[PDB]
Amino acid sequence: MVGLTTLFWLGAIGMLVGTLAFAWAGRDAGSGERRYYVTLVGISGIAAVAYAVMALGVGWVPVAERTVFVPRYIDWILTTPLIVYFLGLLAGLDSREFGIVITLNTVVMLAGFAGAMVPGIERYALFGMGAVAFIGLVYYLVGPMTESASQRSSGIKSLYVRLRNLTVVLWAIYPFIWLLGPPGVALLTPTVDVALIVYLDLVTKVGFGFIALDAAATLRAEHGESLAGVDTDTPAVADLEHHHHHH
C-alpha cells in the first residue's frame, strides 16, 4: 500500500539514530571494544537498508491473497544471528557452541520465512517447530551463557543481565505477532501488527545498543580511557641506597 510504507520509513529513522550513536561513540572508544561497536553498528546498519528498501515497495512478493516481504524475513536471517552473536561476544562461548546458537537461528528464521509462504494453513506446522526451537534459543540466553558471562569480567555481568533479560523479553513477543498478526491468523490490523514487528527489530538493536553505550561508557570511565604505552627515555631516579661508605 501507500500508507503501509510509512512503517518501514519510521523504523529506518530509528536505525539511523542508532547507527550514528554507535559509530561516533565507537570511534572514540579504545582498542578492543571496537569489536562490540562495529558489531552493534552492523545490525543497526543492515536493518537500516532493509527498511529503506521495503519502504519503497521493493522485495514485496505476492501470495494468493496475502503479501509476504522477502527483505523483511531475510533481514531477520542476517540480524537475528547477529544479535545472539553479540551475546556470544559478551560471555565468550566456544567454537562449537557459537555454531550451535547461529545454526539454531538459521532453522528458526527459515521456519517463519516459509511460514508466510504457505498456500493454505500448513504454516501452523512450520511455526510449530519455530516455537519449540525458539524456546531452545531463549534457553541458551539464560543457560550456560549465565556462568560464562558472569565469569568473564566484572562489567560483563552488567551488560549480560541487561541485554539478555531485555532481548529475550521483547523477542518472546515475536511468536505472538507472527501467529496473531497477518503472518498467522491476522487478529489486528495489517498496519498495526507491522508497526509492532518493525518495533521489535528496532527495539532489540537500538534498545540494547543504547544500554550498550552507557555500560561501555562506564567501563572506560572507571579509569578514563584504556591505558597504553608511554615514550620516556632515562627515567627519574629517587631511591638507590649506597653500599659503599668506608673503604
Ligand SMILES: *C/C=C(C)/C=C/C=C(C)/C=C/C1=C(C)CCCC1(C)C
Ligand atoms: C533486529 C532484528 C531482530 C533481533 C529480529 C528477531 C527475530 C526473531 C527472534 C524472530 C523469530 C521467529 C520465530 C522464533 C518463529 C518463526 C517466525 C519468526 C521468524 C517470527
